[PDB]
């Protein structure tokens, strides 16, 4: 936005949220009137409503960085439900199910962090380190259980969670010199 009347290069404008207006601080011209509360709007996606009574709660938050954009609900039991139709509609989801399956290597990272007592911020860095280096030609053919063992120390080394390489050698697995070279070809990327 830039005031149509004034036009000074550093466009000094204020967001008078309380009056729901966007004003030019110099001439006072209102540049916009429709203005939305982003906090409360975000409350509609990530709420505390797990029961299902909130009429405001109408969407859900996702993580486009880690799981791409895979929107998908799950057939489950409701109040008035026969245990028959749940099974059929779930047995029908089985026929509809390669790299769209290597996302189960996130389940390998998640089950490793929880076995290593690691926080929720470390898993999401280990999952982003693994997604951006598992199909690299720079890693080529490294021990596939030692490149995800190296991306956990990459996620810990940014989230400030102290984990020695010998601490991850105890988890899995690690071949020392094998997951030490792999911890460097990724570090360049």
């Amino acid at each position: 936005l830039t005031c149509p009347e004034c036009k000074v290069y550093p466009p000094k404008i204020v967001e008078r949220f309380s009056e729901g207006d966007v004003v030019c601080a110099l001439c006072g011209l209102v540049l916009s009137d429709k203005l939305v509360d982003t906090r409360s709007e975000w409350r509609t996606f990530s709420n505390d409503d797990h029961n299902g009574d909130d009429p405001s709660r109408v969407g859900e938050a996702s993580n486009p960085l880690l799981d791409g954009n895979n929107l998908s609900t799950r057939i489950g039991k409701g109040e008035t439900t026969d245990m028959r139709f749940t099974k059929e509609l779930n047995k029908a989801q089985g026929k509809n199910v390669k790299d769209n399956e290597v996302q189960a290597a996130f389940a390998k990272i998640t089950m490793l962090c929880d076995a290593a007592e690691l926080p929720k911020i470390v898993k999401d860095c280990a999952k982003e380190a693994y997604k951006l280096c598992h199909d690299e030609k720079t890693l080529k053919g490294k021990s596939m259980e030692s490149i995800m063992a190296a991306s956990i120390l990459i996620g810990c080394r940014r989230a400030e969670v102290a984990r020695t390489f010998k601490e991850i050698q105890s988890l899995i697995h690690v071949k020392t010199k094998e997951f030490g070279k792999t911890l460097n070809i990724m570090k360049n990327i």
Binding site: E160, V161, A162, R163
Partner: protein, 94 residues
Amino acid sequence: SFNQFVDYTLQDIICEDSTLILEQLAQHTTESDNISRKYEISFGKIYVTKPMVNESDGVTHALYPQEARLRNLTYSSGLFVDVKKRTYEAIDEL
């Protein structure tokens, strides 16, 4: 109420279903078949420390109620259980 749950109830919850076993019985063709095994996993005494905290830099130390309220931590203590893993085997009852 809570004390009764920690001193008694907790142990009995660890001991009701408790032990779980997995049996691997062979095809009885010939070696390396004809080997029937049963593995055990058992849960004994349950321990419970004084409240502690696991900081980001590995170090674990005691945690008082005031530090919990200020650093928004949880005033929890560690649950430890004695585990035992037995192994058994038979050929093609004992």
